[PDB]
């Protein structure tokens, strides 16, 4: 009978890729193995501190609505660094990932400044990188979903895994994402990406982990979401290769 709290960020703001869903899942997971999760909806975030912090998300929106998240953001880019240098599991999205790197480029090639919390950027072209996914993960087993991406994001950090079908950051490297210490960024979304209930788990199992709480049981009934993402791997095995 424990608790964890979740720093949301920017929901407001970041529309176009919402994190909800996610969270959704998360308190779903967490109850199953007896634990209450405490959101927390954090839009303004002056005099804010991550020492009550188990896990945060961050969503995507419109490039308009990133740079305004981003601007509000910036005012604790300190305490967000050390948290995340420190081991604090979060889930970042679309434009939420991207712009933990230090700059986001447009097709005309106007810089947009990233939180510079790691060391990376992205570019992006007009044609985008689009359709189902499926990803191999040494971590989080078979990771599945949707992607319609015109950014490529270059960094050389951790990444969620080999790409199996698709692209995933970039047109070459066959690898999706970030994984960084504890702090995970995807260009999946929407109401697949939850079905990837490891991801959930895993946020979950690592937050138990630094705040000393049980995480029991490990293991529960997943038959929905290991059918639901089957049918998408299904798909994904009888169509051409993405080339
Ligand atoms: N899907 C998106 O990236 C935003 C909306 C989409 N570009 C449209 O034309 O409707």
């Known amino acids: 009978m424990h608790e964890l709290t979740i720093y949301h960020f920017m929901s407001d703001k970041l529309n176009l890729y919402s994190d909800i869903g996610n969270i959704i899942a998360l308190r779903q997971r967490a109850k199953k193995r007896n634990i209450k999760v405490n ?6 975030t002056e005099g804010i501190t991550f020492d009550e912090c188990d896990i945060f998300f961050i969503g995507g929106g419109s490039d308009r609505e990133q740079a305004l998240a981003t601007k509000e953001l910036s005012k604790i880019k300190t305490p967000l660094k050390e948290a995340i240098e420190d081991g604090m599991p979060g889930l970042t999205i679309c434009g939420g990932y991207q712009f ?18 790691l060391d990376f950027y992205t570019e992006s072209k007009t044609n985008r990188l689009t359709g189902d996914i499926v990803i191999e993960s040494d971590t989080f087993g078979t990771i599945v979903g949707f992607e319609n991406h015109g950014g490529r994001t270059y960094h050389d950090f951790g990444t969620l ?3 199996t ?14 994984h960084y210490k504890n702090l995970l960024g995807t260009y999946l979304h929407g109401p697949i990406l939850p079905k990837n209930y490891e991801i959930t788990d895993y946020l979950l199992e690592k937050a ?3 705040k000393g709480i049980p995480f029991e049981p490990k293991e529960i009934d997943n038959e929905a979401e290991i059918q639901a993402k089957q049918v998408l791997i299904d798909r994904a ?6 080339r």
């Open 165 to 178: 079908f698709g692209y995933g950051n970039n047109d070459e490297d066959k690898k999706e994402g970030i």
């Open 100 to 117: 933990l790197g230090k700059k986001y480029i447009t097709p005309d090639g106007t810089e947009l400044e990233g939180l510079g919390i």
């Open 39 to 44: 959101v927390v909806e954090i839009n303004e």
């Open 208 to 210: 138990c982990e630094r």
């Open 161 to 163: 895994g080999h790409v």
């Open 237 to 242: 095995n009888r169509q051409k290769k993405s």
